[PDB]
Design a protein around this ligand. Sequence first.
Ligand SMILES: Nc1ncnc2c1ncn2[C@@H]1O[C@H](COP(=O)(O)OP(=O)(O)O)[C@@H](O)[C@H]1O
Length: 360
Amino acid sequence: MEQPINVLNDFHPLNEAGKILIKHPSLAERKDEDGIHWIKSQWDGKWYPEKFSDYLRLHKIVKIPNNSDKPELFQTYKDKNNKRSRYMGLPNLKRANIKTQWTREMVEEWKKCRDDIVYFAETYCAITHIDYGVIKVQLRDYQRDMLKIMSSKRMTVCNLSRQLGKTTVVAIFLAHFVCFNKDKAVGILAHKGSMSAEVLDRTKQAIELLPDFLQPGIVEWNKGSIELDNGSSIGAYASSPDAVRGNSFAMIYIEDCAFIPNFHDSWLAIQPVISSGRRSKIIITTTPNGLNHFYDIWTAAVEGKSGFEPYTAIWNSVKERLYNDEDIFDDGWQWSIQTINGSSLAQFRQEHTAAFEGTS
Ligand SMILES: Nc1ncnc2c1ncn2[C@@H]1O[C@H](COP(=O)(O)OP(=O)(O)O)[C@@H](O)[C@H]1O
């Protein structure tokens, strides 16, 4: 008699010791509904089609309609043929302080966007599909959750894994913040100034695609900063105490925090910003880098010893990873095995499970 009767013959590197971190897909619940077979994921308790083709089939592909002829259709309208209303002859950008008359429906739609960030994202924001092109973005569950937390909490710290598409959500969040709030100065901080310029560029792209009624008039449009007619702005900087002390930000966004050398002095300088009577917002996102400064920030948040709300999302947040090479749902069994085998458990734990190398 070899291994017992009812013991699965498939093993996974992640279950390297008595601890089952990933359950075999054959043990999951299954059901038939809507004419197809479904399997329940162990990661979120949600149902997924057995076939990747159906997973793709069930997603809506809607292009961002190009409408520059019918104002009545204000939701998709952008007056780019009339370069008089344009900024620097730019067809996608709206000109500042331009007197415009609105209808009742337009005011309500604008308010709806101001108060429902998720609705704003999936109705007026996009991503570039490989073959379909520029279409409206359908947020991943973690992106929807992240957007909601960043908007509802004054300070948020996100411990994320790599390649989750987080820049897309950050861009939408910043675009939303400056478009629906007045006189708010936003500062983007990163290890290198070039990194912050990239975040700013992604945010500029989102604003550019917005219809006339949602897009604020453009006052300034540089590679290092922008200013809108509502008085809000965004600037890209290299993290340092001087960058923090040198401006009065309503919001500071820090990119890849755990990989910023000597961040401690920047963190120190941010304490007065946090405790200021102006109630500034602070958003931090990063993947782990051992037991350094970020580990301390994260731990305080998780233990409730700071004003920061913690948020985390790991590798299984990207659902395409839950289908194998034969386009069959396997809850990420194969993807994780190949990723670990192609690197190592240590690298996978840090890079994809958001674990802190600096062991407990
Ligand atoms: N909800 C989504 N639906 C479809 N594609 C997405 C989504 N979020 C991100 N992406 C795509 O993932 C790609 C890489 O993500 P990006 O936003 O650059 O962040 P990161 O580089 O950290 O993954 C982008 O080209 C983007 O089009």
